[PDB]
Every structure is written in C-alpha cells, then in structure tokens.
Amino acid sequence: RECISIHVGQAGVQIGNACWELYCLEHGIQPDGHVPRAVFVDLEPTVIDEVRTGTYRQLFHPEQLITGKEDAANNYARGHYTIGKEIIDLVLDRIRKLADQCTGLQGFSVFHSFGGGTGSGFTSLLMERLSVDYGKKSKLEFSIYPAPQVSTAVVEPYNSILTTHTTLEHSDCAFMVDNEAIYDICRRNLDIERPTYTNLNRLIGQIVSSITASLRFDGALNVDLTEFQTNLVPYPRGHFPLATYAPVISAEKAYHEQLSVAEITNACFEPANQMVKCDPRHGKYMACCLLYRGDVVPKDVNAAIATIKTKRTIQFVDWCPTGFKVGINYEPPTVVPGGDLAKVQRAVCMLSNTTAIAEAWARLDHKFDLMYAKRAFVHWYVGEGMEEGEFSEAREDMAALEKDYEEVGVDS
Amino acid sequence: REIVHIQAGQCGNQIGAKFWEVISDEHGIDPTGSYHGDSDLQLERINVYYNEAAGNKYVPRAILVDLEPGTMDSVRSGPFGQIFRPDNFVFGQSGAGNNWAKGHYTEGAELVDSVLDVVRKESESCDCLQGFQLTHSLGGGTGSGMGTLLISKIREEYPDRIMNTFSVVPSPKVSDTVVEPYNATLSVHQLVENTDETYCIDNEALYDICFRTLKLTTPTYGDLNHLVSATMSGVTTCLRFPGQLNADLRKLAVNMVPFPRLHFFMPGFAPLTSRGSQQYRALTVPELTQQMFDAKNMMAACDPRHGRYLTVAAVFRGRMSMKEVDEQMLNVQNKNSSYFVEWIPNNVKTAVCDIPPRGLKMSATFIGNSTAIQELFKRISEQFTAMFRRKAFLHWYTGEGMDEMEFTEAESNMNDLVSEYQQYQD
Ligand SMILES: C/C(=C\c1csc(C)n1)[C@@H]1C[C@@H]2O[C@@H]2CCC[C@H](C)[C@H](O)[C@@H](C)C(=O)C(C)(C)[C@@H](O)CC(=O)O1
Ligand SMILES: Nc1nc2c(ncn2[C@@H]2O[C@H](COP(=O)(O)OP(=O)(O)OP(=O)(O)O)[C@@H](O)[C@H]2O)c(=O)[nH]1
Ligand SMILES: Nc1nc2c(ncn2[C@@H]2O[C@H](COP(=O)(O)OP(=O)(O)O)[C@@H](O)[C@H]2O)c(=O)[nH]1
Secondary structure, three states, rough: OEEEEEEEEEHHHHHHHHHHHHHHHHHOOOOOOOOOOEEHHHHEEEEEEEEOOOOOOHHOOOOOOOOOOOOOOOHHHEEEEHHOOHHHHHHHHHHHHHHHHHHHHEEEEOOOOOOOOHHHHHHHHHHHHHHOOOOOEEEEEEEEEEOOOOOOOOOHHHHHHHHHHHHHHOEEEEEEEHHHHHHHHHHHOOOOOOOOOHHHHOOOOHHHHHOOOOOOOOOOOOOOOOHHHHHHOOOOHHHHHHEEOOOOOOOOOOOOOOOHHHHHHHHHOOOOHHHHOOOOOOEEEEOOOOEEEEEOOOHHHHHHHHHHOOOOOEEEEEOOOOOOEEEEEOOOOOOOOOOOOOOOOOOOOOEEEOOHHHHHHHHHHHHHHHHHHOOOOOOOOHHOOOHHHHHHHHHHHHHHHHHHHOOOOOOO | EEEEOOOOHHHHHHHHHOOOOOOOHHHEEEEOOOEOOOOOOOOHHHHOOOOOOOOOOOOOOEOOOOOOOOOOOHHHOOOOOOOOOOOEEEOOOOOOOHHHHHHHHHOOOOOOOOOOHHHHHHHHHOEEEEEEEOOEEOOOOOHHHHHHHHHHOOOOOOOOOEEEEEEEOOOOOOOOOHHHHHHHHHHHHOOOOOOOOEEEOOOOOOOOOOOOOOOOOOHHHHHHHHHHHHHHHOOOHHOOOOOOOOOOOOHHHHHHHOOOOOOEOOOEOOOOOOOOOOOOOOOOOOOHHHHHHOOOEOOOOOOHOOOOOOOOOOOEEEOOHHHHHHHHHHHHHHHHHOOOOOOOOOOOOOOOOOOOOOHHHHHHHEOOOOOOOOOOOHHHHHHHHHHHOOOOOOOHHHHHOOOOOOOHHHHHHHHHHHHHHOOOOO
C-alpha cells in the first residue's frame, strides 16, 4: 500500500524536489505541518545541500538525505563502482529502514537522470541492490532521457547506455522524460522563453503527482503501480513508457480551459505534448495508460477513445486489441499558485509505451559509437575501475533493446 | 571540497596576487580582515580556497615560491600582500636566473623539499580536497622548471586529486625573455604529463583583448593579471556555489580531456566591456555566448578559428534560462559546426552557476580544448630547434648540471603533443 521514492543526482534531487513540492501542495500541509517517504543521494554536496538549506529543507530527515563529500564527476563508472559504493550500502540501509517502516509497501520511484554521474551509474547499483532484495515488489523509475540535441555533459551517452542496461534488467517500468521535448512545449503550449529548470521539474511533478498520488486515490477504476506495468509493460524488458499530459495550457495565452474531456484526450496523442522528443515517427503504441483525474465521466472517456482509436492514423499495435488501461481519479490537478500552468478541472497523464522510444534509444546510442569508436573519454572510466567489456556489453545490450523495441512491433 | 593554489615565481606571484585579488573581492574579503561579504553565500564554499585559523581571520590556502626575493616582497610589502601566513612563503636568495635548469635542478630543487613540506601542511587541511591551482609562466625560471619540479612531485603524493595550471606560454610576438623557447619546452615537458588541465595564457592576446575588446590606453600588468583572474576565477571557486547544473575541476577534466594527455585549454570571458564607454550590454545569453566563442577575446594568441574543437566547456553564472543556454550553445554548435569535431556528438559541456560577478548580471567563463593550441605548442617549439642547432644559451643550463639529451627529451615529448593534437583537428 506504500510507494518508496528514491531521488539521485542533481536531476534526481531536482526533478524530484519539484514533484515532491506539488505533492504536499495538493495535500494541503505546509513546510513542517506528517513525514515524507523518500531518500536523496549524491556524491557531490552543494546540490543536495541546496535543498537542506532552503524550501522544504525541514520536510526530510537528515537520515534520508544521504550525501557524499567526494566527487560526483559526470563519469558513470565513478558513481557505480569507485565512489558510489562509498555511500550505497548506507542508502540500501536507509531504504530498508524505510522499507520495514510500513504496512506492506509496493514498489519504488527512482527519479534520476541518465546522462550524468550520480544519477546514471550510482542509481544503477541502487536498483540492482534493490531489485535483488525486493523481487517480490515493483521498481518504477523516471528516466530523464538525455536530450536529442540540447545536451550538457560531453559523456552523456556513455553514462546512459551503461546505466539503462545495468538497470533495465531490474526496474519494472521506466517513465521517459526528455529535457528538450519539454522545452518544445514551454514555448508552444505555454508561451514563455524563460523556462528555468524550476519549470521543467514542475511539469514533472505534474506528471508524477499523478502516476502515484492520483492513482493511490479513489475513483472510477483505481490504478496502482502494479496495474501499470501489468498493463503497460508487455514483456520482461523493464520497458520504459514516455510520460505525457494534455491540459498543457499557457496560463495567459489560452483564456479557455472549459475544453471538454474529448479535446484534451486528442492532445495526448498529438506528437506535441509528448514529454519525450520521441515523436511517433513510426511508433505503434503497445499500451497506453490514459489517467483521467477530476471532472471526467466514465462514458465521455469511454468514447473519446472509441475514436482516438478509430482515428486509425493513431495506429495501434496489431497484437494488442484493447490497449487502454484507463484510470479515473476524482481530484483534478492543483497547479503551483504562481506557475504558468493555467490549471484546469480535468487532466490526463497519458503515459504510454510506444514503439517510439525505439528512436532516442537508437540516437542516444549512436552517439556512444562515435565516441567509444575513439575511446574518447574512456580512460576517465577504466581508471575508476572498469573494463573494456562493460562498454562493450552495455552496447550489445542496447543492440537487443533495438532488436526488440522494433521487433515486437513493426511486424504483425 | 578544497583546492590549493601555488603561485610560483614572480609572474605567478604577480598573476596570483591579482587572482587572489579577484577570488578575494568576489567573497568580500579585505586584505587580512574578514567576511565583510555583501552576500551571506560568499562564505560556505570558501573551503575551496581559504582556511579557518584565527576564526575571523582566514588564510588563502596557497604557497608562493621563487628564487629572487625582489618580487615576493613586492607582494607582501604591497597591497593585498599581507594575508598569507609567513611560512606560506617559500623562496631562495639564490641566483634565480632565467634558467629552467636552475629552477628545476641546481637550485630549484634545494627549495622543493621545503615547499612540498609546506603544501601537505595544507593538503592535510580538512575534508576531501579537489585539487591544486598552480599559476606561473613557461618562459622565465623560478616558475617554469621550478613549477614543473613541483607538479611532478605533487602527483607523487596526490595521484588522485586533479592537477590544474594557468601556465603563461611565451607570447607569439614579443618575449619578455631571451631563452623563451628553452624554459618553455623544458617546462611543459613536465606539465603535459603531470597536469590534467592547463589553461594556456598569452601575454599578447590579453593585450589584443584589452586594446580592442576594451579600449584601455595604458594596459599594465595589473589589468592583465586581472583578465586572467576573471577566467581563472570562474572555472574553479565560482563553480563551487549553488548551480542549476554545477560543475568542478573533476567534471571539467572529465569532460575537458578526452585522451590522457591532460591537454591544455584556452580561457575566454564573455561579458568583457569597454570602460564607461560601453554601457549597453543588454547581456542576454546570445551576447554572452556571443563573445566567448569569438575568434578573438580568447586568452591564447592561437586562433580558435584555426583548428577544430574537442570539448568546449562554457561555464555560465548569473540566473538565466537553460532553454536558451542549450539553444545558444546549440546554435553556436550548429551555425558553426565547422570547428566542433564530429567524433564527439555533443562537445559543449554547459554549466550554469547562479550568483554572478559583483557589478555584473550574466557572465560566461570559457575553457575551449581546441586543436588550435597546436599553433603555439608548435610556435614555442620551432623557436627551440633554432637556438639548439647552435647550442645557444645551452651552457646556462648545462653548467647547472643537466644534459643535451634532456633538451632532446622535453622537446620530443612536448613535440608529439602537437602530433596527438593534429590527430583530431582532422
Ligand atoms: C577599475 C576596474 C577594473 C580594474 C582596473 S585595474 C584592475 C585590477 N581592475 C573597473 C571596476 C572593476 O570591474 C569591477 C566592477 C565592474 C564589473 C563589470 C561587469 C564591467 O562591465 C566589466 C565587464 C568591465 O567592463 C571590465 C572590468 C572588463 C572593465 O572593462 C571596466 C573596469 O575598469 O572595471
Ligand atoms: N529536467 C531536468 N533535467 C535536468 C535537471 N538537472 C539536470 N538535468 C539534466 O539531466 C542530466 C543528468 O543529470 P545530472 O544532474 O547531470 O547528473 P548528476 O547525477 O548530477 O551527475 P553528477 O553531478 O556527476 O553526479 C544533466 O546533464 C542535464 O542535462 C533538472 O532539474 N531537470
Ligand atoms: N601576465 C603576466 N605575464 C607576466 C608577468 N610578469 C612576467 N610575465 C611573463 O612571464 C615571463 C617571465 O617569467 P617570470 O616568472 O618573470 O620569470 P621567473 O621569475 O624567473 O620565473 C615574461 O617573459 C612574461 O611573458 C605578469 O605580471 N603578468
């Protein structure tokens, strides 16, 4: 009945500090007014420290806030082997401590971010240490997928490829979330060219303060995390859907919210609100998971789809006759009092699993080649204890996640 | 985490005196007084450069070495000069010369075993130190071989920590020395393989960038050893503030040095402005990302526009949109894809601190690792072959106990460094 949350690496502690900010927000309980239920970790202070030194600082027990005084450094192999271990067993401890502290939990929510250090490699040996200490549970994680162009670190791919592979075989479901894809929504569906990170993470807490919080609420047909993967992930691969949202409205550009259930539902499947720059450039959804919350009726939802569907150029897999595990809460969103999200009565959270990520996976992999093809920053890893194999494998691995996320589909 | 500075030689004691005259002010820290900081933030990460003794009194964690008192006294008997504990000074009444062999052998040695002793007294300061900051010049003496003997003995006790250096490579036009090339080649011989990041600075560029990017008419060293300081500042320290995506020497070297060679850089500032004349400065991100990558305004006389780019790493600082940063660092990467290398799909290693330069809004320290530093590493090398085929001032080195093979060594060592750099500019 309880869902553990793990927040690692600046992103992780960031994206999350924004999802865990709308949370209490929509639960009417100020700064210190019960107790949270996660645990933040980094191997480079300042970021974590920028939490425990400002807003919410007191809504977490310093025990959870594990932090390392070493050097994160954007090299996977340093957060996993070399330094991650220096604080990992300590985290497993915290988690268990939080694991035993409850009445039959459920799964975990590991918010992090591929292309970096502590979030990439570290989480990697967090989930491994999880999934083989909780096989009887679920392991969901928000994969902030390295943007398709607007990057940051030079290694970006290295970290990822290795992270995804050393995690796939563990988690049960990974919600992709791109950085640019979002940007390309905060200028189209919000009209603001000053989108600070504080915003990209508020839009996460808007697609996160659902999957769970909502679900965990009462309404039409409740949806636990279990149902998710049971309806969202076709095969063992920890298959990673790509979060979305429709009531994505500019709280000053669109002077209209009374946009009935149908219309928003149309938005979801539009290759624009997608939270991932994985435009359905072929992709065939294998199983969407439209989650309505608030003023949405079980017949209007059971109709918007009997056309989203028969729209055909909506193209759904062959093998999946009815891939629409619907969800319907009773409470609508609760926009940040001063954000840019005009806030509305209804709202979807459409977090489908489409033969789309089959894309970024590819590109975000081809980057790996070009680099590794000259070893590039490789030594920055081997020194941190690694072998030419890891890089080898965590590739051949992807090769499969290719010969799989294109195979299962495309062919009928 | 903590970093430790080692201003070596007049130059370094001159550059440093101006570095510590920037990293100081940026923290509101009077000559020897205390945190009279405008901000309440300019003092939580100072454990990167300062130390906590007389509580109220800090001690810039750095040592100063030399071999001709005439400069250190200049410092201490000068402005900021008094603030570094006494022992924090190391030097000799010995014949400094402009002999590299004297700073790294006959004399430079007999001064290191006391300089090494010093540094550890600081290395064992407290918490996980990030690395070392060694500023100096590669054409003089007490800084070249004397420095080299240090960074190559520092690694002997700190193979883990990160090795930095803002080495002043001999200007392309006019050397303030004679045996420029000698002290040079011989110098990097040690850096190229004892450092893992080295911002090459050209005493000339800083002129070009002070007379043309600015329009200052009597650009003295105080200005120069400032300019340097700005970048030298940004990179380190500055990066140890809260950042919407903060970095540090680790991630820099980890993003800035593809192959083991440690590789050398090129600092660039972005918000440089012409005195009271240029108010303007709408200072966005494109006008900050505008300067930075410009074919001038770069500290080393090398032409960025003369070779590809391995891994640029513009460090931003001053509340701004990531959305544009990427965009701006993207459009500069695209509309200019010519000089960015393809075997590194996304060179740029953005970093966006938050707090900016005091009387400044948005800043943009730069650190390009272009194959354009093969234009000087060639320069300072072609001058060598010259004066060697005539064994020119060779006897100021020899006489100081040395070899004719070591000059062969160092050069050939520092010579392929241009080769492995051509191995990517193509
Ligand atoms: C006397 C000045 C610099 C200086 C002269 S000799 C020395 C060591 N420093 C002044 C004031 C100091 O610059 C600090 C405050 C103003 C910073 C602004 C962001 C400024 O616009 C900056 C980009 C500049 O214009 C320079 C500092 C590069 C310079 O052109 C103006 C100047 O002389 O600043
Ligand atoms: N949406 C979003 N993306 C972010 C945020 N912060 C960083 N990112 C992106 O996610 C990538 C990976 O996350 P990082 O924070 O770099 O990883 P990390 O764990 O901090 O890495 P280290 O600091 O080396 O340990 C970054 O390179 C950015 O491109 C954030 O708050 N929101
Ligand atoms: N930027 C800068 N360069 C300097 C300064 N003083 C000297 N130099 C440079 O450093 C070279 C000489 O190095 P120096 O350190 O004086 O020699 P040393 O004392 O024997 O090591 C000169 O040729 C100049 O290029 C200074 O204050 N600032």
